[PDB]
Every structure is written in C-alpha cells, then in structure tokens.
Design a protein around this ligand. Structure first.
Ligand SMILES: Cc1cc2nc3c(=O)[nH]c(=O)nc-3n(C[C@H](O)[C@H](O)[C@H](O)COP(=O)(O)OP(=O)(O)OC[C@H]3O[C@@H](n4cnc5c(N)ncnc54)[C@H](O)[C@@H]3O)c2cc1C
Ligand SMILES: Cc1cc2nc3c(=O)[nH]c(=O)nc-3n(C[C@H](O)[C@H](O)[C@H](O)COP(=O)(O)OP(=O)(O)OC[C@H]3O[C@@H](n4cnc5c(N)ncnc54)[C@H](O)[C@@H]3O)c2cc1C
Ligand SMILES: NC(=O)c1ccc[n+]([C@@H]2O[C@H](COP(=O)([O-])OP(=O)(O)OC[C@H]3O[C@@H](n4cnc5c(N)ncnc54)[C@H](OP(=O)(O)O)[C@@H]3O)[C@@H](O)[C@H]2O)c1
Ligand SMILES: NC(=O)c1ccc[n+]([C@@H]2O[C@H](COP(=O)([O-])OP(=O)(O)OC[C@H]3O[C@@H](n4cnc5c(N)ncnc54)[C@H](OP(=O)(O)O)[C@@H]3O)[C@@H](O)[C@H]2O)c1
Lengths: 399, 399
C-alpha cells in the first residue's frame, strides 16, 4: 500500500473500499473520482422504492465510516499513466497516486435495433435514468421491457403495482438466465404472468417505427416507453488503454491485483475467480461489490489478511417475491423444501453436486437462507432426506 | 527486468524467450528449470517425421542463440514464494529470482472413461509418449484415436502411411473444432476417409473391457492401442497456489505480466488477448509460443518496445495436406480460391467480416499464405471479385 490512494468510481464498491481502508488503519490521502454529479448512492432502490416514492435522500450511501476523503464528484477520469503514476481528469487536473484502484462498475448494454428509435428508450442504471423513466410512467401508460433479468423484472413488478401495463420481451426461453435455477425461473415467469405482465419468450427486437416495436416474428407492440435491460458491459476502457489484461472486465486475483503494478480493481468492473465453478466470471452482485471492496482494502492495509474468498450470492425483490439466490444454479440434484404455488409463495431450493451443497434459493423465506449460506461455504454433505424433510431445522443442521 | 532471471519450463516458448533476452542485451543470470530429462526439443515432429524415422537428434531446439544459460533438466519446480522471490525445486534446491517467467506449457486432457483401462492408452505430448506409441505400432496393428484435433489427425495420417489401420472417434459433428473454418473441416474429413481412416462422428467413449472400446451408441471397437487427443490443460498449478489469476491458463497482458509483481508467463500456459476476436483465449500454437516469448523478452530488455501484437496462426501437416490457418474461422462471407477436390488438393479460403479480411486458409499453397497474413494484419478491405478471381496475384495485391 503506497500513498496516496486514488480510486476511480464512486459506486458501492468504491465506498465500501475507502471505508475499510480507514477502518483498517490507513490514514494517508484518499481521493475518489466519480463521474456522476451525485452524492454516492445505492442502486437497487432505483427499480423498487425510489421508482415509487421518489426520495433520493433515502438511498444515499453512508460515507460516515470513510472520514477525510475528497470526493471529486461530476468529474470523469480520462486516462492514467501507469509509469508516471498519474490520472488525467476531465476538468484539466492531474492526480498523482501510489496506489490506483479501479472501481468503475459497468454500463447498460445498448440495443442496436433501437439505436435510431423515435420513441422514449431508456436504460436503468443511474439516478438520472430512474427519474427520467419515473416521469413517463403515468398509470395506464404502456411500458415495454426488453430483457428478463432481475432489473427488468424488478421494474416490471414495480410498474404493475403502480397501474402500468407491462409487456416484457426475452430472447431466451426463460427469465433470469444468469445464475437462477430453472425451477425458480419457471416460477418467476408464472408469478409475473399472474400479475398481468405480457411475457414474450423466444422473441427479439428487430427495430422500430413510430412508437411501435418490431419483433422477429413479424409482430408488433405499441409502447409509451421502452426500458432496455439486456445486461451490462464493464467500464474498463481506461484499463484497456493503459495495457491491463481485459476482456469485458478487468482480470484480478483475490487481492484485487491487475496485471499492472500498483493498479488494483474491484466490483462490477472485474472478472474474478468464482470459488465454486473455479472459472473466472464478472460477478455483478451487490454483495460482491461491498465484500470484495472490503477484502481488497483489508489486505492492502494488512498483507497477512487472506485474499477475497466469498461465495457469490444475491437477492431480488420482485413485487411479492423476496428472492435470495446463493451459489450455482444446478448440480446433479435439486431438493425442494415446501411447495411451489402462486398461492402464498414460500419455498427453498438446495442444489447438490455429488452430495455437497453448491447452491440455494429462498423465496419468501429469509429464515432458511443464512444457514444455507453457511453450509454452502464449507461444502457440507448432509443427509438428503433430512434436507427434504420439512420437519428439519436448517439452522440447527448448520452445527 | 530484475536479475537473476528464472524461467520455469523448457519448451519452445522458454527457449525462444531466453534466446531473445540474450540477443536483446541482457547478460545477467538465466536459469531454466525443465521437468523433462531431455535436451530441449520441438514437439510437432512427434506426430510426423519422428514417429516415422525415430531420430530425436533431428528435432532438438537450437540453444545456440542462448549462451550462458544453466538448464536444470529433469527437475520439477514445486512451488514459488512470490514474497520471498524464491522457487523450490524437486531436488531440494532453492532458486532466488528477480524475475520469474512461467513457461510451463500444457498437458494432455485425460479421458475419464478409460481411466482404469486394461489396454495401452497413451497421450501424445512428449518424446517419451512418441517413443512408447511408436513401439506398439507394427504395420497392420489396429489404432484408435479419440479426438479429431490436429494432433489426432496428424498421427492418423502418419500411421496410415505406415500401414496401420486407424479408427478415429470425435464427439462433435466435425473435425478441427478449434479454429478451423467449416469448409476446411469438411474437406479434411473427406481426405482422411479416402485414406482409409474409419471416422466416427457424434460418438463418445463410455468405457472399456478387455481390449475393446465402448461408445455411447452401444457399439464396439477393438484396438491394439488407444491414443487420446481431446485437448490440453494449462500447467498453471504453481500459479494457482501462489495466488496469480488463473482459469485453465495464466492471465497475462501483452507484456506477459501476470497479476503478481515480478512474475511473467508465456506460451501454452497463458490465456491472452486475441487481437481479432478481442476476447481472451489460450492460444496454444507453435508461432505464439515462439513469437510471444520473443515479444515479452524484448519488452523486458527495452520497455519502449511494443507489447506482443501478433495475430494468431498455425499450420498442420496431415499426410498430403500442408494446411495453414490464420485468424478467425468465419466472418460474414467466405471466398474460395481454386477448387476443393481430393484430386490434387490445392485451394485458399479467405474469411471476410464487413469487408475486412479476418481469416485465411491455404491448403497446399504456401505461396498465397504469407501475403494473406500481411493483408490480415492490417485489416485490409480489398475488392472481393479480385479476391475470388484466379487471375489475381495476392502478393501483388498486398502492396
Ligand atoms: C436498477 C438496479 C437494481 C439492482 N438491484 C440489485 C439486486 O436486486 N440485487 C443485487 O445483488 N444487486 C442489484 N443491483 C445493485 C448492484 O449490483 C450494484 O449497484 C453494483 O454491484 C455496484 O458495483 P460497483 O460499485 O462496482 O459499480 P457502480 O455502481 O456502477 O459504480 C461505478 C461508478 O463509477 C463510475 N465511473 C465509471 N467510469 C468512470 C470514470 N472514467 N471516471 C469516474 N467515474 C467513473 C460509474 O459511472 C459509476 O457511477 C442493482 C443495480 C441496478 C442498477
Ligand atoms: C504432437 C504435437 C504436434 C504438434 N503439432 C503442431 C502443429 O502442427 N502446429 C502447431 O502450431 N503446433 C503444434 N504443436 C506444437 C506446439 O504448439 C508447441 O509445442 C507448443 O505451443 C509449445 O509451447 P510451450 O513451450 O509454451 O509449452 P511446452 O512445450 O509444453 O513446454 C513446457 C514444458 O515445461 C514443462 N513443465 C511444466 N511444469 C513444470 C514444472 N513445475 N517444472 C519444470 N518444468 C515444467 C513441461 O513439462 C514442458 O516440458 C504440436 C504439439 C504436439 C505435442
Ligand atoms: O442486470 P440485467 O437485468 O440488465 O441483465 P441480465 O441479468 O444479464 O439479463 C438480461 C436479459 O437480456 C438478455 N439478452 C442479453 N443480450 C441480449 C441481446 N443482444 N438481445 C436481446 N436480449 C439479450 C439475456 O438473455 P440471455 O441469457 O439469453 O443472453 C437476459 O435474459
Ligand atoms: O491438440 P489436440 O488435437 O489434442 O486437441 P484439440 O485441438 O482441442 O481437439 C480435440 C478434439 O477432442 C474433442 N474433445 C474435447 N473434449 C472431449 C471430451 N471430454 N471427450 C471427447 N472428446 C473431446 C474436441 O471436440 P470439441 O470441440 O467438441 O470439444 C476436439 O475435437
């Protein structure tokens, strides 16, 4: 850890990082460069409570645990010179660094077919996005969402609840293709359909003409607004130009090291090792953003601390469903605790691979999720009849 | 570049590297650690001329351009301590380093279903492999090859030429799945079939019983020997334990930097950026091994030198076919120069993507290959009618 410390990006990863630095004992300079002119804020309300109530001061990140940090807000880092150890800012200034940390997150993928569209076409990543979307969402408006991921589905539920007609187009055969078990996805589809979401599977957007959307089946949807949610791309441009190893994401080891000396990276912008699959992936979860930021910071202050080791997990609030997914989506067996019914949805999925717990889903069942993550974390091999038996208490099982 | 320099591995990548270091001006210590007790040798003859003539002194690498290098042959590097800057050897010694270079290549993938087989089951990576295979290959023996890659096919051609009956099992629908254009693969299949190779597509090996092989269709093949050629895995174990970023291959930037300070990597062991596809891949070609070793060495001696920039390419001698493949296997158009016939095979493929040359195949046509690689290297967009016209001279076109 060489002073001063410069962090590029001011999302949850960056805030968690600089906070931990200060908690761990680092008392030298920290400068954070954030391109949004916004007091650092959390993103998940943007599809739920913020979209509904509109209060941005309810979603700001607590910077309290990060004292003596200069936050250059509304400034874009344009390049860095890894030899000179400087960063070049959009306002003409230059920042020196001993240690440069890239926490630049990711930006929504654009839809090429709507590239020159004549109707409102938004993505949903920022406070600015949310406000703009929120403002074309009168009740009884007609909203099209492209993409069946968690963002689209969260928005869908939040919009239906308002009284918006929602139609969702998904090019695959199922929702939540990224890290959701099939069972969960079938159910999730079934829930939103029962809420009045018009689902289109196996469909692609081919273009648009005057407030109407064209699909690859020759059909048509008329929309008052279109929200695209087909995934994100890492903001790694700076890394690519300075010569770091990248492929839609900056490669880092478990200490957050890039291939460039004195340059680290964390959060959504990173491709890292998934300890379960063994493969490198861009883990774009909230918990990763925070937990990886902390791990990397902790190891910079105390090199004897371990590298980042957390198994991946996330939640997703979609209307009445509080969904929690941990680990892998499938193994060689799935055990279902409880019943899968739209009538009072509450159930638990456990995914097993040669007897070891490798994944878990809790829908409306937080009580079960935490002990499953503990059992998942130490690759436990419990009796499957006990795992299936409703009488079993999972919290107890975990000791 | 900090002295002394320790290189792990003694294949073509390592030799090319240490040679360039010395040519570029580095005159400090170089120690190479090679686990095979063999004077450094080139691998491609192992499936062609060596397999036929048996002369290992015809395939040694010229170490002449690498003076004053100590080659610890027959020694395995067991671990390295990246903090202490030491390497631990299988013979009890410890090597200090300023600069550690991992050039440990890759090892053949094993076939789980033959894991406990009772008949000769070999892979073909080493001099030792070749000799052992060579010695169970009487004319009119029956050989099974699993895998339709270049190694299997090279062996197949070399064996048929001897008078061996060859049967080849491929789990995919085509040969040469890795970086071969479809057209080439259809033809290559067609050639070997006409040479008496019994091709089995869509088939898997399920197990074995007493000198007979079991496929997923319930059928059976009797073999006097089985040579498995279903790909390789990077030898990156040392890197995984020392904390470098790996996923079947060590991630390196274009200077060969890993995520660990003072530790570089090159050749088959690396996942690197493919300048055409933009993606990271394990490029396991001969030319990469040599050219990347040189680039990395050159940049260590002179940091003003550029990073490694070569577009990928390879050749493959399969009996009567001298095949040369450069770039990507497909674009939005394929142009065929000449005719595709088993009767005197000679043709050229050019792959185009939005007008730019992105790939080329020459079968028995070396004259055309070099200028295609030049045109490929600068993403040229030539008239397609001129590219198709047999009258056109490609060498001329390249200026
Ligand atoms: C609508 C929405 C809903 C979500 N809901 C969930 C959920 O249900 N569950 C869940 O697990 N996660 C969800 N996420 C939350 C999420 O995962 C976190 O927002 C994310 O992981 C944050 O990681 P980050 O800080 O690394 O990236 P970011 O939050 O994107 O931070 C990066 C910041 O750096 C900025 N930046 C980029 N380049 C530069 C530059 N050159 N100079 C200066 N600044 C730059 C970016 O503009 C950005 O503001 C949701 C996200 C969204 C958008
Ligand atoms: C049969 C065959 C045919 C081929 N034909 C072609 C062809 O037609 N065209 C083509 O483009 N390429 C072909 N190749 C050649 C090829 O691509 C090169 O052999 C390869 O790219 C060499 O790269 P390398 O030096 O990085 O790996 P390697 O040659 O595998 O060098 C690595 C060496 O380091 C050793 N090592 C590993 N770990 C340790 C350790 N811990 N300590 C000490 N030593 C260690 C390995 O045992 C190995 O000897 C062929 C290869 C084979 C085997
Ligand atoms: O977070 P998030 O919810 O925004 O992203 P997300 O979790 O990745 O989900 C986005 C959805 O959009 C789909 N998609 C990806 N690329 C697409 C394309 N080029 N055209 C149409 N659909 C595409 C994905 O399906 P796929 O899994 O099929 O890519 C996925 O289901
Ligand atoms: O060099 P090289 O010639 O050794 O390797 P290679 O170029 O990668 O070719 C190996 C061949 O074996 C196949 N293969 C890969 N994994 C397999 C498996 N688990 N079982 C059966 N076949 C498999 C590959 O087909 P695929 O492309 O289908 O993997 C490929 O065609």
């Amino acid at each position: 850890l060489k002073a001063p410390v410069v962090v590029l990006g001011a999302g949850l990863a960056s805030v968690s990082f600089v906070a931990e630095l200060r908690q761990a004992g680092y008392q030298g300079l920290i400068t954070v460069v954030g391109d949004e002119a916004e007091r650092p804020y959390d993103r998940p309300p943007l599809s739920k409570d913020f979209m509904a109530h509109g209060d941005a001061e309810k979603i700001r990140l607590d910077c309290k645990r990060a004292p003596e940090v200069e936050w250059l807000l509304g400034v874009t880092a344009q390049s860095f010179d890894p030899q000179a150890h400087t960063v070049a800012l959009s306002d003409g200034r230059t920042l020196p660094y001993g240690t440069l940390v890239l926490a630049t997150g990711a930006a929504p993928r654009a839809l090429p077919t709507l590239q020159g569209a004549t109707m409102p076409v938004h993505t949903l990543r920022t406070l600015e996005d949310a406000r703009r979307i929120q403002a074309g969402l009168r009740p009884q408006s007609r909203l099209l969402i492209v993409g069946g991921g968690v963002i689209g589905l969260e928005l869908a539920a939040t919009a239906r609840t308002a009284g918006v007609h929602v139609s969702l187009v998904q090019r695959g055969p199922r929702l939540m293709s990224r890290a959701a078990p099939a069972t969960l996805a079938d159910f999730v589809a079934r829930y939103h359909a029962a809420q009045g979401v018009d689902l289109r599977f196996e469909r692609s957007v081919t273009g648009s003409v005057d407030g109407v959307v064209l699909l690859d089946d020759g059909t048509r949807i008329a929309a008052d607004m279109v929200v695209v949610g087909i995934g994100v791309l890492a903001n790694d441009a700076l890394a690519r130009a300075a010569g770091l190893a990248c492929d839609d994401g900056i490669f880092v080891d478990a200490y957050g090291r890039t291939t460039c000396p004195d340059v680290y990276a964390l959060g959504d912008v990173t491709r890292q090792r998934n300890p379960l699959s063994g493969r490198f992936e861009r883990i774009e979860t909230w918990s990763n953003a925070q937990n990886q930021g902390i791990a990397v910071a902790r190891h910079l202050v105390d090199p004897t601390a371990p590298g980042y080791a957390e198994l991946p997990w996330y939640w997703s609030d979609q209307g009445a469903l509080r969904i929690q997914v941990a680990g892998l989506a499938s193994g060689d067996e799935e055990i279902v605790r409880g019943e899968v019914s739209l009538d009072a949805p509450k159930f638990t999925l456990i995914e097993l691979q040669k007897g070891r717990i490798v994944g878990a889903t809790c829908v409306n069942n937080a009580r079960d999720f935490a002990p499953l993550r503990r059992l998942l974390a130490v690759g436990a091999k419990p009796d499957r009849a006990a795992l299936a038996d409703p009488a079993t208490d999972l919290r107890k099982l975990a000791a």
